[PDB]
Amino acid sequence: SGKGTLKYLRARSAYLELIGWDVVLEILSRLGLTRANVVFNAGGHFMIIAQNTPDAVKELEEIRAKAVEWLYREFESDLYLAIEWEPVSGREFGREGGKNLFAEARKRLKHKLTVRKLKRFGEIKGLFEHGHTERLAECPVCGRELPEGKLEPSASDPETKVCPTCNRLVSLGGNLPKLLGFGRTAKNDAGVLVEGPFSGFVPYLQGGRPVGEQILVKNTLNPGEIPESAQFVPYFVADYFKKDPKGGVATFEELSMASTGTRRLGVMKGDVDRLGEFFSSMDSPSKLATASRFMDYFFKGYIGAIIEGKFGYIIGDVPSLRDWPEEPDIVVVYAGGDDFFIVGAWDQIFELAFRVRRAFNAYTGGKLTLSVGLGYFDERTPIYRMADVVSERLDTAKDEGRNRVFVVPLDGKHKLSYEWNHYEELWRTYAPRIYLESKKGLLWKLLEIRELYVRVRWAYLTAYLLGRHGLSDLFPELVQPVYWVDGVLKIVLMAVR
């Protein structure tokens, strides 16, 4: 709801991770395997290579049992974990004859999962039993029924009663500057904030000794100050937050109060076009593990390099309202292996969405493209409204032609989303001429001249208007190019109040 701040949302994303690493690190431990078996673990979707014994399958069916019963007491069917397994042979780990046997044996497993996300909680045996629990209050922030009251007073306003698992994610969401990882240990132990299905997670802060059997360390491959008996799990996370002058993460307000122009909250959400058909030509398990790290490393670690502004050689010249600052005001909420959800100022989340497409295009050889949704919102807009808009507005810029930036006629021959080079060629021309001192009536009426064209009366109307000032060099082909100037005008108008 509108009661959850950004430090909360940033802690929801960092707690779906630990749910994902609790499940994988219980499959590896009760099967005797090591973290070399985890082929990928990337935004909820992880693949593990194990053995086919009647003792391994007996243990997986307890893990799939206890994880789904955990994910139901905690979250009333908002989140489900589908786990399946395909007994593959030895000869199916690589190409044989002319047919790819590995991708053929991995599409036999994608169908077990497809048929399981339909049947969403078919291992509860009281899923459809309407047992009537009494005195059900209801959390404001997330919406959860909670039995018999038992709601902790919120640390923000003690006149409101939240569920217990949001007082954790405020405290966790406050520790995100300091937090160097998490120690993963027994659920009934000192310091455990959050709980996964199997373990309980302490925060390993900066000045503090790590406790736990296994210690997850964010964003480094260096087991620095871990005991010599623990287990080292490195895991990477895309984590660029603009700070406040406090030790903390900047607010939806405090970011958007540093956008030049009108003050908006910019919200971008996008993912790699046609990714699953990239991983089906990978025919050996060494070749899929290659193609899955490099795509994960881009979104984990070569996006925080972009928000730094490093390597504008390989990016070049992008649509920039102002020159890219030294410490940008961009918050990376969720960065998945094939997609991301970043918020920030409207000003710099616009330049970043061309500083990302341009770097991804060179990070591959060109043979994989992106697709972005972009959003402009008031600061005090709730999240569920904001994200459902931009997820649709990403889906809008996808089912057209899947390589299209969204930025800002009822026939069917038009389409809302600019393509990438299209917008970057409209910006090379129309923007360096108009960026006309306080002549905004030349600009705002021209958008209303444009909005008769949607409804060739517009041509001479622009012709007198460009003439009754004396702007002939500006927009010569404007007297369909009147349709594709709405991107560049409506942005540069916002850059000047």
Partner 1 sequence: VDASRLFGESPDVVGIKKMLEKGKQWEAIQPYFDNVVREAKNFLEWSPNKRLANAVTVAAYLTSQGLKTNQVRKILDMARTTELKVKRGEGDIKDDLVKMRYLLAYTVGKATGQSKYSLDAFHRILDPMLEVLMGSPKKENFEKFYDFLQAVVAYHKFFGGG
Partner 2 sequence: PKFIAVKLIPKGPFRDIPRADTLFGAIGNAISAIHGQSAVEELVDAFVGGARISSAFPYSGDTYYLPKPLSVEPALEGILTGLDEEERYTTAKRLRKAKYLDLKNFELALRLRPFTIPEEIPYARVDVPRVVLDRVTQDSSIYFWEEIRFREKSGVYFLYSGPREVFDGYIAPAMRFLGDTGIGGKSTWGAGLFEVEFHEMKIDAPGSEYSVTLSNALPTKTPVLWRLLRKGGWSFGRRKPRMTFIAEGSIVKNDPGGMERLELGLSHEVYVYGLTFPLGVELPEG
Partner RNA sequence: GUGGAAAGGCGGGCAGAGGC
Partner RNA sequence: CCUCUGCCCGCCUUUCCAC
Contact flag: residue 145 with partner 2 (CB under 8 A)? yes
Instruction: Give the up-direction half-sphere exposure of residue 6: CA atoms within 13 A in the CB hemisphere.
Output: 29
Contact flag: residue 459 with partner 1 (CB under 8 A)? yes
Residue with tokens 């895309």: 238
- Please give the structure tokens belonging to residue 38: 């985890």
Taking the C-alpha atoms of residue 464 and residue 482, their distance in angstroms, rounded to an integer, is 16
Fill in the per-residue mask, 360 to 399: x = in contact with partner 2 (CB under 8 A), - = not in contact. Answer: -------------------------x---------x---x
Taking the C-alpha atoms of residue 262 and residue 266, their distance in angstroms, rounded to an integer, is 11
Minimal CA–CA distance to 66: which of 106, 38, 26?
Answer: 26
Q: How far is the CB of 167 from Zn ion (least distance, A)?
A: 9
Cβ closest to partner 1, residue 268 vs residue 482: 482
Taking the C-alpha atoms of residue 180 and residue 218, their distance in angstroms, rounded to an integer, is 6
Q: Which does 231 bind (CB under 5 to 8 A by kind): partner 2, RNA, Zn ion, none?
A: none
Minimal CA–CA distance to 14: which of 143, 161, 174?
Answer: 174
Q: How far is the CB of 114 from partner 2 (least distance, A)?
A: 6
Q: Which does 77 bind (CB under 5 to 8 A by kind): partner 1, Zn ion, partner 2, none?
A: partner 2
Residues binding partner 2: number (CB under 8 A): 26
Tell me which amino acid residue 280 is.
S
Ramachandran area for residue 81 (φ above 0: left; ψ -120 to 50: alpha; else beta): beta
Q: How far is the CB of 469 from partner 1 (least distance, A)?
A: 10
Fill in the per-residue mask, 1 to 20: x = in contact with RNA (CB under 7 A), - = not in contact. Answer: -xx-----------------
Yes or no: say if 400 and 417 are a contact pair by the CB < 8 Å rule.
yes
Q: How far is the CB of 440 from RNA (least distance, A)?
A: 4
Yes or no: say if 201 and 193 are a contact pair by the CB < 8 Å rule.
yes
Using only C-alpha atoms, the chain has a radius of gyration, in whole angstroms, of: 26
- Hey, which residues between 300 and 359 contact partner 2 (CB under 8 A)? none
Instruction: Give the up-direction half-sphere exposure of residue 181: CA atoms within 13 A in the CB hemisphere.
Output: 28
- Hey, which residues between 438 and 477 contact RNA (CB under 7 A)? 438, 440-441, 468
Contact flag: residue 464 with partner 1 (CB under 8 A)? yes
Yes or no: say if 168 and 194 are a contact pair by the CB < 8 Å rule.
yes
Q: Which does 163 bind (CB under 5 to 8 A by kind): Zn ion, RNA, partner 2, none?
A: Zn ion
Yes or no: say if 403 and 419 are a contact pair by the CB < 8 Å rule.
yes
Contact flag: residue 163 with Zn ion (CB under 5 A)? yes
Cβ closest to RNA, residue 154 vs residue 403: 154
Triad 151, 140, 248: Cα angle to 5°: 90
Contact flag: residue 480 with partner 1 (CB under 8 A)? no
Out of 85, 93, 121, 484, which residue is the one contacting partner 2 (CB under 8 A)? 121
Residue with tokens 């909360």: 8
Q: Which does 135 bind (CB under 5 to 8 A by kind): RNA, partner 2, partner 1, none?
A: RNA
| C-alpha dihedral (458, 425, 331, 377), degrees to nearest 10 | 10
Contact flag: residue 103 with Zn ion (CB under 5 A)? no
Contact flag: residue 308 with RNA (CB under 7 A)? no
Contact flag: residue 139 with Zn ion (CB under 5 A)? yes
Yes or no: say if 271 and 340 are a contact pair by the CB < 8 Å rule.
yes
Out of 461, 493, 495, 496, which residue is the one contacting partner 1 (CB under 8 A)? 461
Contacts of 328 (CB under 8 A, 6+ apart): 240, 242, 307, 309, 344, 345, 348, 352
Q: Which does 51 bind (CB under 5 to 8 A by kind): RNA, partner 2, partner 1, none?
A: none
Contact flag: residue 409 with partner 2 (CB under 8 A)? no
Instruction: Name the residues that contact Zn ion, by CB under 5 A.
Output: 139, 141-142, 163, 166
Instruction: Name the residues that contact RNA, by CB under 7 A.
Output: 2-3, 134-135, 137-138, 159-160, 378, 380-382, 437-438, 440-441, 468, 497
Instruction: Name the residues that contact partner 2, by CB under 8 A.
Output: 76-77, 111, 114-115, 118-122, 127-128, 130, 132-133, 136, 138, 145, 274, 276-277, 385, 395, 399, 402, 412
